[PDB]
C-alpha cells in the first residue's frame, strides 16, 4: 500500500495442503519494509 509518500510491504510464508486455491483458515501478515520513496502508483505487474 501507499500512504503519505511511504510504500509499505507486509508478508507471510506458510505451508499448505491445497493446489487450486487459498486456504479457508486464518493467518496474519507481518511488516517486511516501509519505504520513504514518494512516487505516484496506479499500476503494477509481477516478474516471472
Amino acid at each position: 500500500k501507499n500512504i503519505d509518500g511511504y510504500f509499505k510491504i507486509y508478508s507471510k510464508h506458510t505451508p499448505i495442503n491445497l493446489v487450486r486455491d487459498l486456504p479457508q483458515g486464518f493467518s496474519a501478515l507481518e511488516p517486511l519494509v516501509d519505504l520513504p520513496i514518494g512516487i505516484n502508483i496506479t499500476r503494477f505487474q509481477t516478474l516471472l
Binding site: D4, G5, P36, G38, I39, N40
Partner: peptide, 24 residues
C-alpha cells in the same frame, strides 16, 4: 538560510516548477 554568497552568480542552473512527491 540565505545563500547569496554560495549559490548566486545569474545562477539559472537552479530550477523550480501531494506530500513528499518527487515530480521531476
Amino acid at each position: 538560510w540565505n545563500s547569496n554568497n554560495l549559490d548566486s552568480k545569474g545562477n539559472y542552473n537552479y530550477l523550480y516548477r501531494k506530500p513528499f512527491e518527487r515530480d521531476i
